Amino acid sequence: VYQGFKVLRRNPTFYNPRSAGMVALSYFAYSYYVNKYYKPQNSNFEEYNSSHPHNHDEKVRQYHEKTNQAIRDAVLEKRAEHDQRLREEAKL
């Protein structure tokens, strides 16, 4: 920096070092809080696909999954039977 000293005399490091440190500490604390506690809670991956889920949300999700699977299986079977019956009736 040409005339680096004259340029950096007034503000070598910070204008309000205390406030800069408070900003850094708040940012660090908030990142810690979010990542460690808040986002994992919302994601709810601790008991994901657990065979014995103790969480109501996970139990509801597994219920939705099994119910959708049962619906798809039943409808596929019924449609196959219906198509077979129609094909049999066609050749008469």
């Binding site: 900003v23 940012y27 990542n35 919302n42 994601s43």
Partner: protein
């Protein structure tokens, strides 16, 4: 050895199963460049809060633009970084001219931000930060070892030799001139009508 020490009363597997939760909680995961970028963005926000001089506010807005460009470069959106910088440096230039016209001396209103900071803004921000997180399941880098990720090494040579593109404007043209051409024309009409409105406001 930790295994030898633990073997006297339990197994290392059990000791780890008990202490690893606390270890993970106290483990900081971040990269120096990302931390620096984010901290400087937030520090520029703080400087904007505490500075009332219009010239310094404009300088900090310019530095914020520079740091946004730096993030885009880190994320590898270099073309958009360049476009942002060229588009906004002219705006900052015009803002400097406007400051020369109005408030040349730089003297600003004698405003004390502490009163509102303690009455409304600090607690409201605390509540918003406590109850606000939209990121659902995005994972930080260093969350898992980089050696588990492998897709970035995959290369499609058939598509490569079938690809004739040579510039990074292909998505932009496919959007502005093929798919979002309706919004492109709307923007053109909006700018024309805005020029008319500006002329009428001048009159």
């Amino acid at each position: 050895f930790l295994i030898t020490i633990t073997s006297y009363f339990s197994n290392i597997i059990e000791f780890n199963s008990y202490i690893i939760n606390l270890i993970d909680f106290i483990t900081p995961l971040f990269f120096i460049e990302n931390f620096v970028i984010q901290f400087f963005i937030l520090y520029l926000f703080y400087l904007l809060i505490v500075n009332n001089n219009l010239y310094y506010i404009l300088l900090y807005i310019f530095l914020e633009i520079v740091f946004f460009g730096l993030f885009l470069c880190l994320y590898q959106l270099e073309l958009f970084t360049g476009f942002l910088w060229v588009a906004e440096f002219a705006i900052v230039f015009i803002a400097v001219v406007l400051l020369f016209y109005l408030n040349i001396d730089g003297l600003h209103l004698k405003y004390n931000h502490n009163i509102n900071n303690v009455l409304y803004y600090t607690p409201s921000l605390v509540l918003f930060l406590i109850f606000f997180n939209i990121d659902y399941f995005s994972e930080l880098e260093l969350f898992l070892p980089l050696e588990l990720s492998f897709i970035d090494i995959y290369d499609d040579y058939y598509e490569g030799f079938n690809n004739s593109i040579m510039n990074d404007f292909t998505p932009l043209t496919l959007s502005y001139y093929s798919i979002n051409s309706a919004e492109f024309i709307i923007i053109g009409l909006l700018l024309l009508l805005g020029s008319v409105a500006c002329v009428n406001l001048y009159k």
